[PDB]
Amino acid sequence: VKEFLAKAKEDFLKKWETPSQNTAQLDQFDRIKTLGTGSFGRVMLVKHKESGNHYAMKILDKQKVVKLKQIEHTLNEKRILQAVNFPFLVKLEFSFKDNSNLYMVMEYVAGGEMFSHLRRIGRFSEPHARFYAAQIVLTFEYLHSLDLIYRDLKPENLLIDQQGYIQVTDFGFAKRVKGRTWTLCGTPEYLAPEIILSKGYNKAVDWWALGVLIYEMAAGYPPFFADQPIQIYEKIVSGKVRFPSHFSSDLKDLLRNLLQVDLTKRFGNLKNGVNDIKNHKWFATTDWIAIYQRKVEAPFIPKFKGPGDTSNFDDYEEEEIRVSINEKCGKEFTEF
Amino acid sequence: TTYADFIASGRTGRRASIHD
Ligand SMILES: Nc1ncnc2c1ncn2[C@@H]1O[C@H](COP(=O)(O)OP(=O)(O)O)[C@@H](O)[C@H]1O
Ligand SMILES: [Mg+2]
Ligand SMILES: [Mg+2]
């Protein structure tokens, strides 16, 4: 399959080298409702006047970005997002900025975060969890082949589309790196031990995170948890994992290989790469090509009621979009 | 049960990313 990835890389490189800029403007959209928030910045449901299409607009306050020292991270996010193209990755339609904010307009994925459905239902059956896992596996295979590291896998960053398929959003911590990196970033429950221990890490962290994800989906709770992050880190470092009695023998086997504290033994980081994962028994009944082609019938299809429907998202407190009369941090975000 | 301990924990809602 190296053939496919090979030509996909040519596409990526072209856009990575010469990114698109300023492909729209704020007055072309009608701001409708906040779909979600994060460490900073919100995502709003917007409607494009000329086309009538609905999109999801991520808004970033330039000043907050600088305060939290996320300039480089924010620049990576946009540069990487506008260059990638994969069935399970959200599409960036437009990007632009003004005196105060940075804007990224993406396709609107109406199904809601996997998070909400997961918490509501409690947990997913293995066949259901496997369906989602396969899509992540292919996505990481694509991303890594481009020397990209995702670094923020979690149900909150995964969306369900109208067909019940996954759409990965939030490339806030995505980074193009050959070799190792050192930033302490991600989400506590999903941090790989090497990150916590500040040893310098690579793409292997994404595979560990997949382990945590699969576990959370099947169990209904993450493998390591507590009330304070520091308490969580201590458990992750220990590597001691307990499996619910309902977990299949194959699932447990796969998990012990992904949640492997030792990098030399962690699945995905070995000689056979992603194949150790794709060939594992738990995925025995998984038709990789069918998933890629989105020909598999989804085990769960979210209730959708026409375009613009946000019933699959929680409600958030709305707030004015402020645009100063003066340009803020112009130099810092020149390339954006 | 583990489930009951999790549900009673302070981290059952949406988790924020970190950049320490
Ligand atoms: N393309 C999208 N379609 C629909 N909802 C989205 C989309 N992108 C983001 N969201 C919502 O916005 C939230 C935050 O977006 P995200 O990129 O994760 O921002 P942050 O970096 O602040 O976490 C998500 O968890 C989700 O609920
Ligand atoms: Mg996020
Ligand atoms: Mg983010």
List the helices and strands and how they pair.
The complex is a heterodimer of chains A (336) and B (20).
Chain A: H1 2-17, E1 29-37, E2 42-48, E3 54-61, H2 62-67, H3 71-81, E4 92-97, E5 101-107, H4 114-121, H5 126-145, E6 148-149, E7 158-160, E8 166-168, E9 175-176, H6 193-196, H7 204-219, H8 229-238, H9 249-258, H10 275-278, H11 288-292
Antiparallel strand pairs in A: 1-2, 2-3, 3-5, 4-5, 6-9, 7-8
Chain B: H1 2-7
PDB class: transferase/peptide
Keywords: kinase enzyme, phosphotransfer, phosphorylation, Transferase-Peptide complex
Assembly: dimeric
Question: What does this protein structure show overall?
Answer:
Chain A: Its EC number is 2.7.11.11. Chain A: Keywords: ATP-binding, cAMP, Cell membrane, Cell projection, Cilium, Cytoplasm, Cytoplasmic vesicle, Flagellum, Kinase, Lipoprotein, Membrane, Mitochondrion, Myristate, Nucleotide-binding, Nucleus, Phosphoprotein, Serine/threonine-protein kinase, Transferase. Chain A: ATP binds at residues 35-43, 58, 107-113, 154-157. Chain A: It catalyses: L-seryl-[protein] + ATP = O-phospho-L-seryl-[protein] + ADP + H(+); L-threonyl-[protein] + ATP = O-phospho-L-threonyl-[protein] + ADP + H(+). The complex is a heterodimer of chains A (336) and B (20). Chain A has 336 residues and is of the alpha+beta class. Chain A contains eleven helices and nine strands. In chain A, the strands form three sheets. Chain A has a five-stranded antiparallel beta sheet with strand order 1-2-3-5-4. A two-stranded antiparallel sheet of chain A has the order 6-9. In chain A, strand 1 and strand 2 (42-48) form a beta hairpin. In chain A, helix 5 (126-145) runs antiparallel to helix 7 (204-219) and helix 7 packs antiparallel against helix 9. The radius of gyration of chain A is 20 Å and the shape is globular. Chain B is mainly α. In chain B, 30% of the residues lie in helices and 0% in strands. Chain B has one helix and no strands. Chain B has one helix spanning 2-7. Chain B is elongated. At the A-B interface, loops of A face helix 1 of B. The complex binds adenosine-5'-diphosphate (ADP) and magnesium ion (2 copies).
